[PDB]
Structure 1
């Protein structure tokens, strides 16, 4: 709602693009936050297809960020017969970035790995990897469960089972609250999908430079499945962490399979033991249900809620426009299955739902908020971010704000969206929009929100011929009533330069020269006053006095008086304020005399 569109933070990257495929907020232990962006198609050791990650300090003007190296070299180790080796060709370092407690985990899902066992070989297959690093410490603990030495003949022998040659671990990187790192591998089990879990502390403990194999304590890998629906399931395409079970103190992983059950799609909730507590499938085939998955409690009830993206949805306008499915967390026995809000974009081929970013209390509204992105939406397919507030009792169905791509067509503005981290540390979380091949990363800063609570004090009714008030000049006896207005500013971090303007309307329904009551001071049927609330918490109530003419004067006495007070922000750069809540009170006064 309060995300500043007119001013944005622009971060540049390599001319080879991909700067913005994935990104996250690196929360420093000191309390600072900086944006870490993976560019999975930067230059290699010698102009090679590789990845790469940049670390941008949080700023406003922006610029060329420094680069954080993880691993770019074709290693080769001779374990007896097996001369195993790694290949950086199109590794994609930066396709998944997640940060936690001074550690950054950035993945290269398409990194290759071949083991030469004399004549036979393991084939140069994309096992993928995800490299961990504490930039302050400098320690690098690369993690790659799918790296192995089992030669291809063994795979071919029995049933091509328990394979990890092309798992592509790290297609989606997330980290729990405790620091446990979770990685997706869509290609695991012969292009079926597996997951990896390992403590970052344990990963750093068990890692040894040079050697290209380990087990790293009790790292938890997903179970291989022979179910036909899982074939080419593409599990671990997108992952997130949130609390969903009946017990606390445990972190669940939500994983998306956009091709589950013959491109139908699914999303699953897993514990650390991978018990599959809940699984919700898609509705439209080839709609890519699960491309991006987000976890946040926008309802404000505390219990986390689920958002699932289907950018390839074909709306029954059969127009290819994505859709975000919302799932509030209920208190039923087997609840959470039925979706509640189905948000759908407008621009054709917009891919509405490629990036769902939790935002938390974006506008100090008391409920969490979200930002969905359609990378090819908008007027001319540029791509647009749709901010949806909590609003309680569900989610804001309408876009509280629409952020337009300032990038040319095809930049896919809005592929990776992250929020839920107050970058301004002002109770107002910000948003970051990165896009694959964008070459630029945009950051939206939220602005203070002012809720208004408005009340009126007007006499309910009176005799038009009371004749108690006295006109100054003419000295005529007239009836009159007490008109007062009190508007107060609620919310957090309200700016002290507030200049709210209140406009009063007496007999609003009646037109001009059809009006009945009329102000003494200004001789007008309505005025605006600077009812500024800046610099104080108490409401301002400056009254007025409008006279009511004699019976014989007018004839609109049969019409009851309408007293509508409407408060609006001043019209006079960036407003830095968003009026919300009650802003128009129309308490009424009727005319009562005999009939």
Structure 2
């Protein structure tokens, strides 16, 4: 409601670099807030699309950014009879970026891994392997919980138990307040999905350059399941952390699954041991249920509620019986041990083919009314199919179904405006959070300063 669309700011990078995909705030020790924008298609040194991450300062006018430097060179090692290789071409470094405190974990979900043995091999599978850096201190480390030398024949004879080869680790990167690095690997364990948590401090303090295959002591991962219901969950598509147990000691893991229970979709809530506590099936099948989650306290009571996006929520109309307008569900959290049940609120879109709900961002007390507000994405909403960002406000009963403020796309058609959203950080020290939105079609990022 107070996010002005007149005064804009435009950070652009290389052309044809898909800049602006994954973007985050970054607060230093002195309180200055920088911006860490990913760009999974920026060219590397070898004239190849090795991705990139640009650390853009806060400038009122925007412009170009100085890129962070990471090891973008292929590594080869010979340990015993095994030859370890890591491949960085077409890795999309920046496709999932997260920054916590003073550490930038800019992750490349497609850094491949392979192991050779005479004639046999472990296959170059997109395990995903993602980097860490501390620009203020200049310390560098890497982590990849799904690296193993198990051969193809052994996996075939065993029949695919504990298969992390297809992890794509770092895809869903959320860092706990405690300091634990949580990764989501929707391709692991027979292409059902997993979750991988290891400490950030252990990651920094247990990495040695030049060793491709090593394991952290504190690595704790999920468990494979033979349940035919669970097949192809993509479990880990978007991890979220919040208080869903009642005990402050345990930070529970909210995990989305686009496909479950015969192509329905689900959103699960599990503890630090990855044991199931709650599970919310999809209300309408294959309607984009199981991707977007946003653990935020919408009602203001103090209990962390839940949001789920569903941009392909098709409904009925009068002229024609089809209306793909997308829908954002609300699941409140009842007092006591009662589980989350029917969807407390159903937010409807209006523009057909609107793609409404592709990203949900908790913008905090945007109006300083006392309740958390969210901004639901729409890459191709609006009358001309250019893009919309719809801001829904929070209240005691939930969310107002009327978008208080809709931001139209400065960029031309095809920019996918509104794809990635981040909030709840005061970039101008004016008292209200300033929202930044990524559009990779225009290779630009629009920073709105709240009034």
- The TM-score normalised by the length of structure 2 is 0.95
1:86 corresponds to: 86
- Is the CA contact (8 Å cut-off) linking 1:290 and 1:308 kept in structure 2? yes
State the Cα deviation string for residues 148-177 of structure 1 (Å, max 9, x = none). Answer: 211111111121221122111111111011
- Is the CA contact (8 Å cut-off) linking 2:305 and 2:331 kept in structure 1? yes
- Call closer, same or farther: CA 1:260–1:8 in 2, change over 3 Å: farther
- Is the CA contact (8 Å cut-off) linking 1:44 and 1:50 kept in structure 2? yes
- Call closer, same or farther: CA 1:260–1:135 in 2, change over 3 Å: farther
Aligned partners of 2:123 and 2:114: how far apart in 1?
A: 5
Aligned partners of 2:439 and 2:74: how far apart in 1?
A: 29
State the Cα deviation string for residues 98-125 of structure 1 (Å, max 9, x = none). Answer: 1111111111112211111111111121
- Call closer, same or farther: CA 1:44–1:229 in 2, change over 3 Å: farther
Aligned partners of 1:204 and 1:270: how far apart in 2?
A: 27
State the Cα deviation string for residues 544-576 of structure 1 (Å, max 9, x = none). Answer: xxxxxxxxxxxxxxxxxxxxxxxxxxxxxxxxx
State the Cα deviation string for residues 301-338 of structure 1 (Å, max 9, x = none). Answer: 12212111112222235322221111222204323222
Q: Which runs of 5+ in 1 are unaligned?
A: 448-595
1:420 partnered with 2:424: yes
| Alpha-carbon shift at residue 30 of structure 1 (Å) | 2.1
Aligned partners of 1:130 and 1:263: how far apart in 2?
A: 30
The alignment partner of 1:141 has SS state of strand
- Is the CA contact (8 Å cut-off) linking 2:271 and 2:277 kept in structure 1? yes
Aligned partners of 1:183 and 1:389: how far apart in 2?
A: 30
| Alpha-carbon shift at residue 131 of structure 1 (Å) | 1.2
- Is the CA contact (8 Å cut-off) linking 1:263 and 1:288 kept in structure 2? no
The alignment partner of 2:29 has SS state of coil
- Call closer, same or farther: CA 1:160–1:79 in 2, change over 3 Å: same
Aligned partners of 1:88 and 1:230: how far apart in 2?
A: 32
| Alpha-carbon shift at residue 385 of structure 1 (Å) | 0.5
Decide which moves more: 253-262 or 107-116: 253-262
- Is the CA contact (8 Å cut-off) linking 2:173 and 2:181 kept in structure 1? yes
| Alpha-carbon shift at residue 402 of structure 1 (Å) | 0.2
Q: CA RMSD in A?
A: 1.5
State the Cα deviation string for residues 439-481 of structure 1 (Å, max 9, x = none). Answer: 111111111xxxxxxxxxxxxxxxxxxxxxxxxxxxxxxxxxx
| Alpha-carbon shift at residue 424 of structure 1 (Å) | 2.5
Q: Which runs of 5+ in 2 are unaligned?
A: none
Aligned partners of 1:64 and 1:95: how far apart in 2?
A: 19
The alignment partner of 1:203 has SS state of helix
Aligned partners of 2:11 and 2:325: how far apart in 1?
A: 29
Q: Which has the larger radius of gyration?
A: 1
Aligned partners of 1:384 and 1:437: how far apart in 2?
A: 14
Aligned partners of 1:318 and 1:155: how far apart in 2?
A: 46
Higher relative contact order (CA 8 A, sep 6+): 2
- Is the CA contact (8 Å cut-off) linking 1:49 and 1:88 kept in structure 2? no
| Alpha-carbon shift at residue 436 of structure 1 (Å) | 3.8
| Alpha-carbon shift at residue 416 of structure 1 (Å) | 0.9
- Is the CA contact (8 Å cut-off) linking 1:37 and 1:97 kept in structure 2? yes
Aligned partners of 1:387 and 1:12: how far apart in 2?
A: 25
- Is the CA contact (8 Å cut-off) linking 2:309 and 2:357 kept in structure 1? yes
| Alpha-carbon shift at residue 356 of structure 1 (Å) | 0.4
| Alpha-carbon shift at residue 401 of structure 1 (Å) | 0.2
State the Cα deviation string for residues 243-263 of structure 1 (Å, max 9, x = none). Answer: 221111432222211123343
The alignment partner of 1:294 has SS state of coil
| Alpha-carbon shift at residue 240 of structure 1 (Å) | 2.1
The alignment partner of 2:104 has SS state of strand
1:498 corresponds to: none
Decide which moves more: 433-442 or 168-177: 433-442
| Alpha-carbon shift at residue 17 of structure 1 (Å) | 2.8
State the Cα deviation string for residues 20-41 of structure 1 (Å, max 9, x = none). Answer: 2111111223222212111111
State the Cα deviation string for residues 400-455 of structure 1 (Å, max 9, x = none). Answer: 100111112222111111101222233311211113444111111111xxxxxxxx
- Is the CA contact (8 Å cut-off) linking 1:263 and 1:287 kept in structure 2? no
Aligned partners of 1:75 and 1:6: how far apart in 2?
A: 48
The alignment partner of 1:262 has SS state of coil
- Call closer, same or farther: CA 1:16–1:262 in 2, change over 3 Å: farther
